[PDB]
Amino acid sequence: PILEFLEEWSMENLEEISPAAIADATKIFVNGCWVGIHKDPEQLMNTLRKLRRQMDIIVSEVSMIRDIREREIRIYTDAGRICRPLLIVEKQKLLLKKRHIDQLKEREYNNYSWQDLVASGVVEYIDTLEEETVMLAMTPDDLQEKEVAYCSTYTHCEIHPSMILGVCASIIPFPDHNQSPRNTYQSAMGKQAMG
């Protein structure tokens, strides 16, 4: 379906071009297969992010990565890649509004689910390759807020920093007040506990 979308749009196939224009265009890869080139990559990236946030043609595990310095767009829909959710930020503002949280509070007897937040394009899955092309915000309450700006272009914001922890390391109270070898020791030992 991604290739169908590209054929619908102005994606120039390799066999259908002279080589000379390749330097004046951006290469397009699909799971490591060069399919062709494109002239205005920014428009294509905007459209692809729009469609993934709308889940029209693209399921929300396909990662799109635009390397400007090499003029390349790599798209991966294969298995084995690892991603995590991240909130989307535009105009230095969260797309997550209080009405979304209100809909979340009534989850039972409402049938509003996480998949609606995925469907509304407020939270999107990002993989480690695409993370390279992200200016991420730790916390929205200070970093996106106006200040003597460290950065003024934040695309994504983390839901909560504590989710970097592991399943058996998350049980540590105040893990950021301990020498990290002690955190590894506790992670090892908690699996050995009795209960």
Partner: protein, 144 residues
Amino acid sequence: TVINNWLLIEGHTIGIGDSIADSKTYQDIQNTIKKAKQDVIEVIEKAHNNELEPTPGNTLRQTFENQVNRILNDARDKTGSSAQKSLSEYNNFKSMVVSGAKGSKINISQVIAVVGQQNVEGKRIPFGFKHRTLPHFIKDDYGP
């Protein structure tokens, strides 16, 4: 035997209150930290403007890295000395370090004032991402 049986009468501990310094001490530590941050910013903008000149037998990156390294080192040492000055006579950390039975002055400076610079291979944290240590920072940043 005799020292333990006396220690029952005396007793020894370690508490949160043993890890507290004066508000003046924290303020002085924070002033030193902001001073070091501003100095590192000065060195960064000097290197950016091609105003930092390399030392003999060292490239510009080596000169900049050594300068910022020693800035953080003496800032950490000054904060540690200030923390050591703030300790009481009843501070159990000082009891355990002066006796030498456990810990060190570096450990007290770590717990109370500044954990300090982390290192891999003897250098600061490398750019695992392209020109970035983590996504939360901007590209081509060399701050502490």
